[PDB]
Amino acid sequence: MKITSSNFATIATSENFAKLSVLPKNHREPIKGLFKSAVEQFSSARDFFKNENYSKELAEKFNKEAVNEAVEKLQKAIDLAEKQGIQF
């Protein structure tokens, strides 16, 4: 229902991803893309700290903006899936 940075990994699971298999193709594929896009962006959200050309304060802002976008993407994927009757 509600996505945050602190429950993201608990909801963006492969079990929940497999719940989308009850959706027809032209509804399932976009939600799957949003889901996977959110997973990818969340996963690499701290990569800015691995870059020694970025100051730690600059890597912080980028980290925060990347997590927030990933949260927004997963929230949309869940919202669109819930509008088609899927319960999480």
Partner: protein, 200 residues
């Protein structure tokens, strides 16, 4: 073994979550799988490593930044007639990675860069604490969330150092619960199939 970016349930212990890839237990498990899978090809024959050969390679992913097939050849004393099964060799092909403790050396480099560890020293952190660190940075990506997981487990200056350099992702297929029982069987020289059947 195989790795994916979404968390999931363990296949052996369905109530437990998949272990993060960048943990001490998961990286050691991936190493043991490779080590026990490795075969030597030579003049039409195929053979696994002796227990001596495996023990000689065991700790090398933990002391150099990387274990390539070339250094494995030199360290095992292989002859030029001997080759590694699985490696395609149609490329230096033995420059490829045999195993890399990415998480082990990431944590080391983080502590070294901040002045809390010497360059070529081993990591002075327990396997369990390395596991908690890899888990925290894999389930959470903000300072606040990660701090909430590690603030009562490891020292403040250490956490500051990790927050400034570490970035982990991906999960293996097995939970840390099952891995903490399968791994020390694989350490005694047992394959992935024996250990799983021995336990499940």
């Amino acid at each position: 073994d195989a790795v994916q970016k979404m968390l999931g349930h363990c296949t052996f212990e369905p109530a437990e979550p998949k272990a993060a890839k960048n943990t001490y237990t998961a990286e050691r498990f991936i190493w043991l799988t490779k080590l026990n899978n490795l075969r030597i090809l030579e003049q039409g024959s195929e053979r696994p490593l002796t227990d001596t050969e495996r023990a000689t390679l065991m700790d090398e992913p933990y002391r150099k930044s990387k274990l390539t097939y070339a250094q494995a050849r030199k360290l095992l004393g292989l002859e030029d007639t001997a080759f590694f099964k699985g490696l395609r060799y149609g490329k230096n092909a033995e420059a490829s990675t045999l195993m890399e403790m990415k998480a082990y050396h990431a944590i080391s480099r983080a502590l070294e860069k901040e002045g809390l560890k010497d360059k070529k020293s081993p990591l002075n952190l327990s396997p369990e604490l390395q596991d908690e660190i890899g888990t925290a940075f894999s389930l959470f990506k903000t300072d606040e969330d990660i701090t909430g997981r590690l603030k009562d487990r490891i020292q403040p200056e250490i956490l500051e150092a990790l927050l400034k350099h570490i970035s982990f992702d991906k999960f293996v297929q097995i939970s840390l619960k099952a891995l903490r029982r399968i791994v020390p069987l694989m350490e005694q020289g047992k394959r992935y199939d024996e250990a799983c059947a021995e336990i499940y």
